[PDB]
Each structure stands twice: as structure tokens, then as C-alpha cells.
Design a protein around this ligand. Structure first.
Ligand SMILES: *[C@@H]1O[C@H](CO[C@@H]2O[C@@H](C)[C@@H](O)[C@@H](O)[C@@H]2O)[C@@H](O[C@@H]2O[C@H](CO)[C@@H](O[C@@H]3O[C@H](CO)[C@@H](O)[C@H](O)[C@@H]3O)[C@H](O)[C@H]2NC(C)=O)[C@H](O)[C@H]1NC(C)=O
Ligand code: HEM
Ligand SMILES: O=c1[nH]c(=S)n(C[C@H]2CCCO2)c2[nH]cnc12
Ligand SMILES: *[C@@H]1O[C@H](CO)[C@@H](O)[C@H](O)[C@H]1NC(C)=O
Ligand SMILES: *[C@@H]1O[C@H](CO)[C@@H](O)[C@H](O)[C@H]1NC(C)=O
Ligand SMILES: OC[C@H]1O[C@@H](O)[C@@H](O)[C@@H](O)[C@@H]1O
Ligand SMILES: [Ca+2]
Ligand SMILES: [Cl-]
Ligand SMILES: [Cl-]
Ligand SMILES: [Cl-]
Lengths: 464, 105
């Protein structure tokens, strides 16, 4: 049991503690770590590789599931309405919450013992990890059920299976549009967006759409964006009293905060009206994840940036320079060359002191150290890894929303009008939302508009 | 794989008709570069005491975090051009793309 001991025996790979650690004073202690499961257990032939339990496609599998039994259990089978099952005990001001899961060792139950609120059941197992994530999961659940309801009115002869699949098809395209239209340009910047994601031409069945092992670590760049608090705002977008700023170490797996502390509306308002944390070379990641990650459900607070680095080793990932070469980017050998690459010699000196050679810098560490591309939130290396991955997921997807035959021309035209602020408008009590782009907009009331000014998705071309 | 299909399978199977497990669930990740393990095939760097990586000692991930990642939270620079929703969509999106299983405790 990797959570209870510091013994380095399978499947454990504990993180060793350095001397003079600011928190863990006992060098015999460790940060818990379970090695990712191998694709070929106990093999003496294979080069160890890890498994992706999910579909690589941007297909909203985090809502629907990536396995047939779970996908069935997430559905409401009591009728022919094609709905996803909702919570049978609680509702958020008359609106649906995710069903509860049935885990033998429920970590949500530990975040507040007296509250007795278990983790939620969704398409992906991490839905309850933070209430901001749960809110996003809940929002997509209500959107599926809202689409299924309107599709039912439009097509009364559609059975449950047809209604579920058609609403599921819509939700997936909505995730694809928001990701590629709004999210990714703000991650990569215009230069890397043009290079790694050129205009979609057509589906190409020779493009491998699998998630690359390195992407599982490189996409953890988002840990640098994490604020140390969960921010909750009322209908006036003012701090919701008495707990408007909850430390993140007290929200991990805290499903009780959604259920018993005001629902998803204060959480969504906080997300839209609070700025993200800027990644700076001297301000990489906050102590809420670096010192106190999962503090309430673990014997010791985890260190997320350290886990990312131990994970890249567990996954046998090449170091910084091998990934630089892969991307056709210069590979610095000296501290002066590293300094030029990072436009920061002081940081280059610290990396050389820790690693000895830039060849050994762990991919997450070197990736997040790089200065950010103009109008982007990653440097050249992460932009190449992330850009390449999202190009393969788009081009190698037969069900990509713009691929011919997936949607009619009229449905594609209707889908181009969708936006995340509209989904918030349609499924919550929030009546004032961010102006497009929602991922840029962050200041109330300057960046905010009333829901009534926003175009709704026109389902007319879904009438059979 | 069915010759005509309007909808995705839940598993991702048959999305690519020539290689129908590509992008499907419960399959090994693709590798863009060969793996680097201490023994060449299974043990991670840092597993064996005294075993170096490319001529240098393996730095403890915790020490790297203390020396390079650690910063005073009061100094936090809010992004004037990004909302917290930008962070949240990223985690939500990652959760559509990948989950690396581990054995239960
Ligand atoms: C359909 O897509 C495949 C794959 O495309 C590749 O991956 C994408 C995600 C992007 O990164 C693309 O830029 C990239 O090409 C295309 O096939 C690929 O085409 C190139 C160019 O012909 C092939 O490279 C060749 O490799 C040999 C050595 O092995 C050299 O001798 C050649 O000079 C050349 O460099 C590449 O191997 C090939 N890959 C596969 C998987 O087949 C394809 O062209 C594209 N089709 C259309 C219509 O767009
Ligand atoms: C509230 C915000 C976030 C977390 C809490 C959180 C936590 C983790 C943890 C604990 C893991 C597993 C770490 C380990 O190797 O031991 C993890 C993995 C991944 N994240 Fe994390 N994350 C939060 C937020 C983000 C954001 C905003 C991300 C991207 C923009 C992001 C990405 C990832 C990815 C891709 C992984 C690997 C997932 C996998 O299992 O394949 N995270 N995060
Ligand atoms: O993205 C991920 N998020 C969480 S919370 N986990 C689970 C935690 C529990 C202890 C070990 O890891 C993951 N395991 C693999 N990937 C992830
Ligand atoms: C199924 O749908 C009906 C009608 O909307 C609803 O009353 C019921 O609570 C739902 N059941 C589940 C398990 O979601
Ligand atoms: C735990 O939950 C109860 C409600 O059941 C709440 O009153 C209490 O304040 C919570 N504890 C903390 C420390 O927030
Ligand atoms: O494997 C990912 C990338 O690797 C390199 C090039 O060969 C690209 O064409 C390819 O997309
Ligand atoms: Ca998916
Ligand atoms: Cl998570
Ligand atoms: Cl409001
Ligand atoms: Cl890889």
C-alpha cells in the first residue's frame, strides 16, 4: 500500500525526501506514489508502456464514459427520453446534480466526515477532484438532458437510444468547438496555432489519433494556472459570504461543498470573474498543490509538480533535449545556451545545479520553465507537443464535427453559434456571463453581458 | 466494423476502420520517442541508489520542486488576459483525453 508506507517495492515508487525540506523534516518519510499499470504485466520482452483508459477523441467521454457498462449505468433507463441519470437525493435550486458513486473507500466522505457526501459518478472517475471540475461536469450533464428534451419535442417518434446518441453527438461537437475555436488559440498563441493546427481540410485515416505518452505529462502545464483558492460569487458577482475564498487544500474531493454550500452557480461565477494564475519563471506553481495536495484524504500532503516529474520517470519519458530535438528546436548543452533558450540565466543556473545536464531536465519541468509564446500560455516546446497532439485528434477523427457526413451543412452552421457562456445561460441560474472569448474575459462587469443578448443553439435542422 | 454508422461507439473502437483500436479506450499509449528506463525496459530513473542518468545523478523530484517551483503565494501574478475558466476547461478537456490507471491501494 503505497499510500501507507515508504517501502520501494512494486507497485510503489515513493518520492525520496531531500535534506532541509521546507515541510517534510524526516528524510525517511516520502511522498506516496503508485507506478502506472503496465500494458504487459510481468513481461521480460516488452519495453514498459502505460495504458490510456479513455478514448483519445475529443468526444465528451468524460460525460458519457469510455466503457459500455459504465455508459449504460450513467443513463436513465426508467424511460425512453434518452437522458443521463441525475442525483436522486439532491438538486441545486431545482436543477440536476450528478448521481453519487459507490466507492468502497470514498475519499469525498473524508473531506467532511459529518456531511456524509460521497463522490459523484460521471464518465471519468476524477469528476469530484475539485468542485470547479464537478461544476463543469454537472453543466455538461444538464446540457445533454436539455438537448434530449428539445430533440424529443422536435422528433416525438425518436426512442431513448436515438435521443441519447443525438444529444451525445451535439455535446461532443460543443466540446470540440470550444476547445479548437476558443481554448487552443489562447494556449498556443497565433504563431504556433498556424504552424501546428492549420485549417481543417478533411479526415485522414492515416493520422494516428492516439494520445502520446509524453502528452499525459506535457498537458500538465495547466497546473501552473491554478489559483490557491476556490472563488465563489453571488448574483451580483460579489464575494459570497461567509466562505468566498476557500483554500484549494480544503476543496479536493469536497463534493459536500457542491451539495451543501450553494451549488454550481457560485463556482461558475468565480471561474468566469476571477483571473487565472499567470505562469512566471519565478512563480511556477502554488503551495496549495506543491505542499498540500489532497491533504484531507492522504496521510501527508502531496506535491503535484514533484509527482509530475516522478511520473515522467515512471513512464520512461526522455528528458528536455530529446523532446527539443523531436520538435526541431535547438538543444542547449551549456548553462549559457540554456540561459539564452529560457531568456533567463538565473533559472538556467538553478536547472543545471539540480539536473547537471539539460538532457536530464524532466519534460514537465523544462516545458513550464520556457518563456511563453506571444499571446500564448506555453513556450515553444509545449506548443509543439500540445499542437501536434491536438492536430492528430482532429485530423485522425472520423467523427470530427466538420468531417463530411457527420453533420449536415445546416447543423454545422447552427453548431458554429455555440459558446460556453450560452451553455451556462441555458443550464443554470446565472443570467450575466462573460463576453466571448470566455477564456480571456475575467473582469466584472467590463467583460460581462446578460444571457438575453446571446444566441441560442438552433435545433431546427435536427427535425428528421 | 459496421459499414455505415452515424454515431461513435462508447470505446472509440472502429473510429479508424483500418486499425480499429486507435484512439479506443484501454490501449497502450503511442510513443513519439523510445522509452528511457534505468535498465532499458522497466525500472524508472531514481529506482536504484547510485545509478546515474546520462552521466549525472538523478535529481529528486521533491528537491527540483523546492528549488525551482516553490515561490511565496502572496507574490502570485493574476493573468489579466485569462480567466480561471481557462484553467478549468484544460483539466476538463484532459479528462476527455487521458487517464493513466494505477493499482488500487
Ligand atoms: C495523411 O496523413 C499522413 C500522416 O501525416 C503526418 O501526421 C500528421 C499528423 C501531420 O504531422 C503531417 O504533417 C504528417 O505528414 C500523411 O502521410 C505521411 O506523409 C509524409 C510525406 O509523404 C510521409 O513522410 C515520408 O517519409 C519517408 C521516410 O519514411 C520519406 O522518404 C519521405 O520523403 C517522406 O518524408 C509520412 O511517412 C507519412 N506518414 C504516414 C503515417 O503515412 C499523408 O500524406 C496525409 N494525406 C493527406 C491527403 O493529407
Ligand atoms: C484542481 C485542479 C487540478 C488537480 C487537483 C490536478 C491533479 C492532478 C493529479 C493528482 C494528477 C495525477 C498526478 C500523478 O502523476 O501522480 C494529475 C494529472 C494530470 N493533470 Fe492535473 N490537476 C489539476 C488541474 C489540471 C489542469 C488545469 C490540467 C491541464 C490543463 C491538468 C492536466 C493533467 C493531465 C493531462 C494529467 C495526466 C492525466 C492522466 O492520468 O493521464 N491538470 N493532475
Ligand atoms: O489525473 C489524475 N488525477 C487524480 S486525482 N488521480 C488519482 C490520484 C489518487 C492517488 C494517485 O493519483 C490520477 N491517477 C492517474 N491520473 C490521475
Ligand atoms: C429519470 O427521468 C425521470 C424523468 O425526467 C426523473 O423523474 C427520474 O428522477 C430520472 N431518474 C434517474 C435515475 O435519473
Ligand atoms: C462540514 O459540514 C457541515 C454541514 O454538514 C458544515 O456545517 C461544517 O461547517 C463543515 N465543516 C467545515 C470545516 O467546513
Ligand atoms: O510523430 C509526431 C510527429 O513527428 C515528427 C514528424 O514526423 C511529424 O510529421 C509527426 O506528426
Ligand atoms: Ca474522449
Ligand atoms: Cl484530477
Ligand atoms: Cl448571475
Ligand atoms: Cl511519447
Amino acid at each position: 500500500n503505497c499510500e501507507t508506507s515508504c517501502v520501494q517495492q512494486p507497485p510503489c515508487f515513493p518520492l525520496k525526501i531531500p535534506p532541509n525540506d521546507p515541510r517534510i523534516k524526516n528524510q525517511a518519510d516520502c511522498i506516496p506514489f503508485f507506478r502506472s499499470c503496465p500494458a504487459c504485466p510481468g513481461s521480460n520482452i516488452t519495453i514498459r508502456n502505460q495504458i490510456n483508459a479513455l478514448t483519445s477523441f475529443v468526444d465528451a467521454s468524460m460525460v458519457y464514459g469510455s466503457e459500455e457498462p459504465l455508459a449504460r449505468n450513467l443513463r436513465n433507463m426508467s424511460n425512453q427520453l434518452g437522458l443521463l441519470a441525475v442525483n436522486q437525493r439532491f438538486q441545486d435550486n431545482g436543477r440536476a446534480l450528478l448521481p453519487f458513486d459507490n466507492l468502497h473507500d470514498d475519499p469525498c466522505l473524508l473531506t467532511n466526515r459529518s456531511a456524509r457526501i460521497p463522490c459523484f459518478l460521471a464518465g471519468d472517475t476524477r469528476s469530484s477532484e475539485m468542485p470547479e471540475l464537478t461544476s463543469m461536469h454537472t453543466l455538461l450533464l444538464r446540457e445533454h438532458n436539455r438537448l434530449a428534451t428539445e430533440l424529443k419535442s422536435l422528433n416525438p417518434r425518436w426512442d431513448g437510444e436515438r435521443l441519447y446518441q443525438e444529444a451525445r453527438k451535439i455535446v461532443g461537437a460543443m466540446v470540440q468547438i470550444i476547445t479548437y475555436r476558443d481554448y487552443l488559440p489562447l494556449v498556443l498563441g497565433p504563431t504556433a496555432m498556424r504552424k501546428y493546427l492549420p485549417t481543417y481540410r478533411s479526415y485522414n485515416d492515416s493520422v494516428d489519433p492516439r494520445i502520446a505518452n509524453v502528452f499525459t505529462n506535457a498537458f500538465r502545464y495547466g497546473h501552473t494556472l491554478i489559483q490557491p483558492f476556490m472563488f465563489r460569487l453571488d448574483n451580483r458577482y460579489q464575494p459570497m459570504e461567509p466562505n468566498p475564498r476557500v483554500p484549494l487544500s480544503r476543496v479536493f474531493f469536497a463534493s459536500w461543498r457542491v451539495v451543501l454550500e450553494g451549488g454550481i452557480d457560485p463556482i461558475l461565477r468565480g471561474l468566469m470573474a476571477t483571473p487565472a494564475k499567470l505562469n512566471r519563471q519565478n512563480q511556477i506553481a502554488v503551495d496549495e498543490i506543491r505542499e498540500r495536495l489532497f491533504e484531507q484524504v492522504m496521510r501527508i500532503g502531496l506535491d503535484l509538480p514533484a509527482l509530475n516529474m516522478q511520473r515522467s520517470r515512471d513512464h520512461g519519458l526522455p528528458g528536455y533535449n530529446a523532446w527539443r530535438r523531436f520538435c526541431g528546436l535547438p538543444q542547449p548543452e551549456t548553462v549559457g545556451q540554456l540561459g539564452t533558450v529560457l531568456r533567463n540565466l538565473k533559472l538556467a543556473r538553478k536547472l543545471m545545479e539540480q539536473y547537471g545536464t539539460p538532457n536530464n531536465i524532466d519534460i514537465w519541468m523544462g516545458g513550464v520553465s520556457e518563456p511563453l509564446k506571444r499571446k500564448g500560455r506555453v513556450g515553444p516546446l509545449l506548443a509543439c507537443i500540445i499542437g501536434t497532439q491536438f492536430r492528430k485528434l482532429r485530423d485522425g477523427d472520423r467523427f470530427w464535427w466538420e468531417n463530411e457526413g457527420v453533420f449536415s451543412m445546416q447543423q454545422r452552421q447552427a453548431l458554429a453559434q455555440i459558446s460556453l457562456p450560452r451553455i451556462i445561460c441555458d443550464n443554470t441560474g446565472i443570467t450575466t456571463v462573460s463576453k466571448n472569448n470566455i477564456f480571456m474575459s475575467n473582469s466584472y462587469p467590463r467583460d460581462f453581458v446578460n444571457c438575453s443578448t446571446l444566441p441560442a443553439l438552433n435545433l431546427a435542422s435536427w427535425r428528421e | 466494423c459496421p459499414e455505415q454508422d452515424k454515431y461513435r461507439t462508447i470505446t472509440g473502437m472502429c473510429n479508424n476502420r483500418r486499425s480499429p483500436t486507435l484512439g479506443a479506450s484501454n490501449r497502450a499509449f503511442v510513443r513519439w520517442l523510445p522509452a528511457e528506463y534505468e535498465d532499458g525496459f522497466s525500472l524508472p530513473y531514481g529506482w536504484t541508489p547510485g545509478v546515474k542518468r546520462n552521466g549525472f545523478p538523478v535529481a529528486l523530484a521533491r528537491a527540483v520542486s523546492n528549488e525551482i517551483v516553490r515561490f511565496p503565494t502572496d507574490q502570485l501574478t493574476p493573468d489579466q488576459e485569462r480567466s480561471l475558466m481557462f484553467m478549468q476547461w484544460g483539466q476538463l478537456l484532459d479528462h476527455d483525453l487521458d487517464f493513466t490507471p494505477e493499482p488500487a491501494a
